[PDB]
Write a protein that binds this ligand. Sequence first.
Ligand SMILES: [Ca+2]
Ligand SMILES: [Ca+2]
Lengths: 143, 55, 54
Amino acid sequence: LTEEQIAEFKEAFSLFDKDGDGTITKELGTVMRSLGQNPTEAELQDMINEVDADGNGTIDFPEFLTMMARKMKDTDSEEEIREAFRVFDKDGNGYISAAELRHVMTNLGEKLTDEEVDEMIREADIDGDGQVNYEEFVQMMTA
Amino acid sequence: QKLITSAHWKVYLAARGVLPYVGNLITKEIARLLALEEATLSTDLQQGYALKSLT
Amino acid sequence: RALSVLGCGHTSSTKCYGCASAVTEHCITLLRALATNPALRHILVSQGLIRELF
Ligand SMILES: [Ca+2]
Ligand SMILES: [Ca+2]
């Protein structure tokens, strides 16, 4: 991380820090968004859960700095691609199945019709054998 | 002003450098007013609405 | 000329629809004068004056 970027991060951090003790208030997610990076509600909620302990006037810059290192605009997500393969595989199938994907889809409020779940799986299956392991999802993420 | 009534969005815009921009536009406005005064003395009435609003 | 440069006579305001129409009338009078000369008439036609007037 260049000194220029870290200075910009602290600049915004202080701009949103009303405590004056190098601790933002509510405006932690706002520093996040203003700093170019635009996290989704889920990403933000998750980050707040990370700083749920204390926070709101106890969020130090290093704390926010560690948070953004975990996800510098989500440039490096490989560490959590295998994690999501494990999560998606709720029954630990070991391969991508339509039922668990459809479950995940419905859990996101997306009620994909089997027809769509099907295209999804068909595209996910490189060899089209009905089973999609870590490698196929990793190839999709590289595409 | 209605959209930024919360200090949340005021601070967000401040992070984007809105105050420098507003002050820069305020600065331009006063220079334009001096140019107008050096030009014919036209008694405009909304003269300063932009300046007052930026301030 | 210094006093004239400082201030002389009176000028119209900006967005003066009335004076803008007066200047348009002056343009019409000047063009009616110019159009008399055949060469000027051809030049004005080549400019696109007919379509503007229409
Ligand atoms: Ca499974
Ligand atoms: Ca396979």
